[PDB]
Amino acid sequence: PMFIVNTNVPRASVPDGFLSELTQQLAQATGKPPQAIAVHVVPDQLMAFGGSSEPCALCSLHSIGKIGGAQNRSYSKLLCGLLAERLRISPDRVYINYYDMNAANVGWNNSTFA
């Protein structure tokens, strides 16, 4: 799984340990081992959400499986909770796009996962 967060929050507000904590929490939530988890945080962005430039986040979670109605609700609670707690972004100012990737469309280590 791969989680990306783009936000207008400044780099100095991203706490040390945030990528590690995302890795561990996503491993637990997806059921996939941490060895397979990639995380990416992109601060200082120029963005607006609902006509305001107050703190917000545009995110995405891509996974080979483990994506669906109930799981996504559960991810959204978890990930909004983390972004609220660590980056002070209110949950109603976060979008998370979920992608269920086909194994044949994910490359890694000179091949794909098919």
Add this chain to the structure above:
Amino acid sequence: PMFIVNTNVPRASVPDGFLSELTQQLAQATGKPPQAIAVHVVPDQLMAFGGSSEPCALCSLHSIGKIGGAQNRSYSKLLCGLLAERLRISPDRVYINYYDMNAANVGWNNSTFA
């Protein structure tokens, strides 16, 4: 809806008001209220388009519905017109990927839109 623009145009060439104007124009084009619109501009990028590093843009519009053949043609005219007018990027150096997101695959406010 969420609109992202990645470009090699410098940050000082993005006019003040560009994010608000994108918000308003996208609200009108998609028929969705501005409260639901998110916009993200990423300048100063290292990129090339057709073997040239002249001004270009790689963009995406994600929306829960309101994506289809005719609408997308209409969005592309609108968006290329704005990028040409405001950032001085020629329309033939812009790509816009359109994604029709399932409500169950978009998180927000601790849950999804399903």
Add this chain to the structure above:
Amino acid sequence: PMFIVNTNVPRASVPDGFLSELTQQLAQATGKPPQAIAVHVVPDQLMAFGGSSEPCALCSLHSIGKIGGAQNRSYSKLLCGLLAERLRISPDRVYINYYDMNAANVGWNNSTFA
């Protein structure tokens, strides 16, 4: 086709010529002409892959066709080889998400490719 590379490798480690070489090699691999190829490199990112912050890359390749099981295996060998050779990123520290785009969902030049 559009190829994007997000990496924690520093900007000074991206060699001159890297975007041109990506353009050329992607043109040969996809069979599409270089006029249609767009490439984007984003260095200095805050990221982790498998619980480590050693050099890694999160990438994507979007193409109107030319995406499938065998082609993606081929692309992944090619692109991991380039990233290993030019940016010193090990292949097992790279993810590449492949997207087969519908022509009606790609805008360019005030219209779409449908």
